Amino acid sequence: AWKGEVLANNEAGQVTSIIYNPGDVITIVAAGWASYGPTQKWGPQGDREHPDQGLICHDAFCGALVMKIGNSGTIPVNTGLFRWVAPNNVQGAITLIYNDVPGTYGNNSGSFSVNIGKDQS
Amino acid sequence: AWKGEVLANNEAGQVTSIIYNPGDVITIVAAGWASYGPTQKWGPQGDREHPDQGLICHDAFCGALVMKIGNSGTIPVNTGLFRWVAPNNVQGAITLIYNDVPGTYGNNSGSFSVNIGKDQS
Amino acid sequence: AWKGEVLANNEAGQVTSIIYNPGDVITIVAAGWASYGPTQKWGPQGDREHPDQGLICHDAFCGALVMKIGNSGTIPVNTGLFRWVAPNNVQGAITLIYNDVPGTYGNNSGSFSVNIGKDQS
Amino acid sequence: AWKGEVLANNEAGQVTSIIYNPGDVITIVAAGWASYGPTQKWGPQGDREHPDQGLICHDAFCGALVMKIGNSGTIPVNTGLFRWVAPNNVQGAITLIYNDVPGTYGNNSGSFSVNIGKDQS
Ligand SMILES: C[C@@H]1O[C@@H](S[C@@H]2O[C@H](CO)[C@H](O)[C@H](O)[C@H]2O)[C@@H](O)[C@H](O)[C@@H]1O
Ligand SMILES: C[C@@H]1O[C@@H](S[C@@H]2O[C@H](CO)[C@H](O)[C@H](O)[C@H]2O)[C@@H](O)[C@H](O)[C@@H]1O
Ligand SMILES: C[C@@H]1O[C@@H](S[C@@H]2O[C@H](CO)[C@H](O)[C@H](O)[C@H]2O)[C@@H](O)[C@H](O)[C@@H]1O
Ligand SMILES: OC[C@H]1O[C@@H](S)[C@H](O)[C@@H](O)[C@H]1O
Ligand SMILES: [Ca+2]
Ligand SMILES: [Ca+2]
Ligand SMILES: [Ca+2]
Ligand SMILES: [Ca+2]
Ligand SMILES: [Cl-]
């Protein structure tokens, strides 16, 4: 398993020690508070009221937690994933990323705390 | 394992099929959007800024997900619990509840989607 | 989890730390060599060529590993059980026992090494 | 998880759907009755009284269940493995094999039934 934090201000994200392999079942739980610029903070689902003006992941809200597995495209994580198997082909290290518009991370603040583990399969 | 929905306006809570037994380890993941009255909605951690006005659980925010286990007090859940063991002498049926003030549930809306599993031991 | 040894010559068997509760999924693995009297030894499946002359479990061979759960009848274990769920209404402490004819355990020798754990469920 | 049979007379063994990856924890349970030639049969630990005449696995008895992982040498399985981690530098598909002398498999009989799964990590 892996525990750690993802900073809202880091366009490169946080690499983990979890290597996702074909067939793996994983569980992720995410918590905490972050902002993409405003004084308000949101949880790991982000801001449901904010439009997409060029986010790295178009399938989650601005301010959400997302990931990449190897050199996949972005995959939504939000509050987490329960006994989840990847939409197929994907493989590699899990990198966690805060969803914002590239070039605009400089006004971001806060972080998410994240646990990941592999399940029975 | 159990999957289901906890309505924000259900004061009595959602009774699950999980009986927490001595020594059990469990994982919970919660998602969704709900409100304790305002037009804005919050995720399962609730609203960090709203003051505690006699919530059923003093150790979680207004609009957070909490639970009881048998005769326990309320216990916080938020976005979830990762490979977690309960307080000494707590056991029995898990009921999931939206954290609000008694008698003030009638203006609530939305729901949280929740999964609960037992882990290896 | 429980890890230990089940002696062939112990008619009362071995009361483990594992309390089987409704819905639990368990794994048991058993290894080793034991005898119900002869100079030869058999593994946890016992002696397939030996007749049943009043065995405590009629559904496994003389010299096999079996168990009781709470106040159940004997249940075959053999080399182990993989992600196993008990029949309805069976619950309580797991006792491991060597399968022999009652009153004939005194000439027995050897033991099985046994691991029991609760699995995800 | 994989469930299947391993024929005692199959010198190439039985390839499974399990790909062992670094960090994986697995469980195996094996059952059944097989022979390397005599009319008598033995369980998955094999025959403790027979000498090694050039077995594919010198670390288990003739008639025992063994395995290979990818390009590995033979590793004992016997009655099974509980929440087991492979040696470092061992990875790839699991193949199950009956322990006999190469070229002498043709007079073998019976089989072992085997379950393999990946466990929480
Ligand atoms: C100035 C500010 O502009 C936006 S918030 C804005 O969001 C983008 C993503 O869409 C980037 O993260 C920027 O860094 C953020 O500042 C308005 O919603 C806000 O009300 C305010 O006017
Ligand atoms: C009228 C309303 O009052 C509160 S919201 C209020 O919160 C309590 C819990 O503290 C109960 O759930 C009520 O049912 C809710 O209406 C203010 O924060 C809000 O701005 C508004 O004035
Ligand atoms: C003829 C037979 O010889 C052996 S059994 C023998 O074992 C080897 C492995 O050591 C091969 O599997 C052969 O296929 C087997 O036949 C004696 O132990 C037996 O009593 C009998 O004389
Ligand atoms: O049938 C069981 C019986 O088998 C014979 S050979 C043993 O000597 C006895 O002690 C008893 O275990
Ligand atoms: Ca920003
Ligand atoms: Ca309310
Ligand atoms: Ca005896
Ligand atoms: Ca042979
Ligand atoms: Cl806080």
A119 touches chain C (CB under 8 A): yes
| Structure token pair of residue D6 | 């391993």
Residues D116, D67: Cα–Cα separation, whole Å: 12
Give the DSSP per-residue string, C27-84. EEEEEEEEESSSSS-B-TB--TTS--SS-S-TTS-TTBEEEEETTPPPEE-TTEEEEE
Q: Which domains does chain D have, with CATH numbers?
A: 1-121 (2.60.120.430)
Report the C-alpha gap between C86 and C75 in whole angstroms. 10
Task: Please name the residue that has the structure tokens 């530098």.
Answer: D89
Select the residue of A28, A31, A83 nearest B117 (Cβ to Cβ): A83
Q: Are B25 and B39 in contact (CB under 8 A)?
A: no
CA angle D9-D14-D17, nearest 5°? 170
Which two three-digit tokens encode residue B12? 């009595």
Instruction: Please name the method used to determine this structure.
Output: X-ray
How many angstroms separate the CA atoms of B66 and B57, rounded?
A: 7
Q: Any idea what DSSP says for residue C99?
A: -
Residues in chain C: 121
What is the spatial distance between Cα D36 and Cα C104, in angstroms, rounded to a whole number?
33
Pairing assessment for the beta strands A26-35 and A80-84 based on DSSP bridges: antiparallel
The single residue listed with the structure tokens 């927490």 is: B20
Rounded-to-integer distance, Cα D69 and Cα D86, Å: 9
User: For ligand 1, atom 15, which residue shows the shortest CA distance?
Assistant: A37
Task: State which amino acid sits at residue B17.
Answer: S
| Residue D107, phi then psi, degrees to nearest 5 | -100, 15
Residue C111 token pair: 């033991």
CA A82, CA C11: separation in Å to the nearest integer?
A: 45
Interface check for D89 against chain B (CB to CB < 8 A): the answer is: no
- The C-alpha atoms of residue A27 and residue A30 are separated, in whole angstroms, by 10
Closest CA to C97 of C56, C54, C66: C66
Site from C3, C18, C28, C29 to mutate, D interface, most D CB atoms within 10 angstroms: C29
- The CA angle B30-D24-B23, to the nearest 5 degrees, is 50
- How far is C26 from C16, CA to CA, in rounded Å? 13
Q: Which amino acid is at A102?
A: P
Contacts of residue C87, defined as CB under 8 A and 6 or more positions apart, other chains included, come to none
Distance of alpha carbon C86 from alpha carbon A31, whole angstroms:
37
Helices H, strands E: what count in chain D?
0, 8
d(CA B121, CA C12): 26
Q: Is residue B6 within 8 Å of B112, Cβ to Cβ?
A: yes
- The strand pairing partners of B95, in sequence order, are B15, B68
DSSP state of B105: G
Q: Which atom of ligand 1 is nearest to the CA of A52?
A: 10
- Report the alpha-carbon distance of residue C109 to residue D50 in Å, rounded: 21
Cα distance between residue A103 and residue B45, in whole Å = 29
Q: Which residue of C has its CA nearest to B20?
A: C21
